[PDB]
Design a protein around this nucleic acid. Structure first.
Lengths: 187, 190, 190, 187
DNA sequence: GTTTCTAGACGACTGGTCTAATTCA
DNA sequence: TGAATTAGACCAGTCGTCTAGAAAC
């Protein structure tokens, strides 16, 4: 409820303004919660950051699992559905960024050990799901053989970099480059 | 000597922003570290934003310049020139270097939604990186050192790859993800 | 166990306020340190202020009870009783003790301008101390242990003297000014 | 000037409300100075406190020096004019304290090592001037022999506690008691 | 002429108080 | 169901920093 409302409002604003660039008041005002309530549920802005990041990964990873077990698609189709979504809902009429790994990693990495680790574990979990799907495709013939752990990492790295350049250009341009390199890397 | 101070401010901003970012450093810490009075900031820059722009502009001028020198080393072919760049990237990331070298990695996501001027500086700067890469790629298609490719796509895909690698490398305080980028780079070339 | 919790809050309030004052301590620290939730506070007191008053009243309750004990102690004459009170004040302010014991010294100046009720409690409390001194001085005029004097005047002067000594002792972290007082006390009483 | 206005205003408010019981905003608003100017001159509230106490003692001892050098009075007359002033300006509409040694000592001694020191040195500065006057009277026949350092210390202690009891009673009653004991201790 | 100083919104966080309803009798 | 206990709402308060611009030696 109130805690969850704060987490949501936080995610919504930090996705755009970052961690250091928002103040508790803006989050608070935008959510209609008093400062004393904020500090009833979180001991600090840092601890709040972590919570929002954990909740973010729980939700993100749930979706990845659902996606990589969708009925009626083979593994390749499942894997590509993920990259396509990344490319699709990132045409740049979208300012409110979806991806906290892209938005917060570099800022937060030297600032909060708890947020650094949460981002770190969260990304590893993302990579983990990719490894499974890559593996599933080696079972159903959808995908060529490869070192699934290496491939998932390299692809994920490639798409992360694309998102940076994408934000830098306000173009989905670099993501198209990513998609294309991905098709090339698989098969 | 006015100019000298100003560069020192710019130099200090780089040392510090590389770690704390743009929103996380204040004018006072920068001025203090550089031996400049607090009251003097606007003697050298119009705003913190324009300071940033200046900070970044100098960063790329020096960077693109080293890239040019690097892509002209006597005794190396195009492939050896290209490989030394990516190699440098892996090396000077002995594993927990939180003292970022790379402002493209450190500042892009933060600054892009915040400052239109810095965003463009970052965008044009990074395009400049890719451009020099394309040139080395082409240089290799000419001297046979590197297989053929769509040069603008390969550099763009490779540069994207190391950027994402760098992020994960900061998240892990390990050079592991970069070692991964290196493997993929070799596979994508030759 | 409701009464015990109340008493425990009172005691914890005393230990901490003796050191941090009234305005410098917060409800949360007192409550947390006592194992009572902050939300339960108003189940035990009407306001921070009345907690303060309660705190002080209980302090004087215990304090004046000692004074009564001491000043009726079997086998000591009146001078001996009176001097044992002053001796303990001197003794228990050796400087391993930076935690004030005495609320009249710690709180009077702070609280007097701030809370009419705490002021009153302190006032009535201090008066009771003076009253017992008076009683002991008189007791000595009865049994020959102490010279004749204006007892209400003397008890007041002595108490004022030691109050000021306690202040300077805190400022110096030494029992020095207290030794001074003790000497002036012997001089005045003889 | 701006610095001095801050120092003066702090004195007027801290004399009444103590140290921990005032906030910068009350001092600042009351004085018409912005937070940014305050922190240009003082790095912290604690250091402001120290600054304040130092200026207080500078002024107080300057005054003691003139009063104890008054034309036409001998040492007894000078010494008693000090004790008298203490009593006089504690007619009881005077709840706005003049005296920081009475007001701040117990509060600040456990809280700020620098403010404790300034209070301590300043109190010593007071006692020194009393010792000198007591000494001057042993020279001009105005005052009986005594251990001057012992007596000034006992007198100052006596008036310190009496000042405490006045605040507690809202009466100059306890100060008269001291004045009387003072006369008995001298003579 | 530039650094001293003005400026006050803003930063994260704590203050004391009080209500609504849980939990316990 | 009534009485005991407290989570949580609430926000003006705390001290201190932020970028920015003006004043002034």
């Amino acid at each position: 409820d109130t805690r969850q409302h704060l987490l949501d409002t936080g995610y919504r604003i930090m996705a755009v303004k970052g961690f250091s660039g928002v103040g508790l008041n803006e989050i608070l005002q935008s959510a209609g919660v008093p400062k004393g309530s904020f500090y009833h549920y979180f001991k600090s802005k840092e601890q709040f950051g972590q919570a929002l990041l954990e909740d973010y990964f729980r939700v993100y990873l749930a979706d990845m699992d659902q996606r990589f077990s969708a009925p009626g698609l083979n593994a390749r189709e499942r894997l590509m559905s993920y990259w396509q979504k990344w490319l699709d809902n990132a045409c740049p009429p979208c300012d409110e960024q979806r991806c906290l790994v892209v938005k917060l990693s570099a800022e937060v990495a030297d600032l909060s050990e708890s947020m650094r680790i949460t981002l770190r574990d969260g990304s590893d979990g993302i990579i983990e799901r990719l490894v499974g799907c890559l593996g599933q495709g080696r079972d159903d013939g959808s995908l060529a053989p490869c070192d699934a752990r290496h491939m998932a990492s390299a692809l994920y790295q490639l798409w992360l970099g694309a998102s940076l350049l994408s934000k830098l250009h306000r173009s989905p341009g670099p993501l198209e480059t990513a998609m294309q390199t991905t098709r090339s890397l698989l098969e």
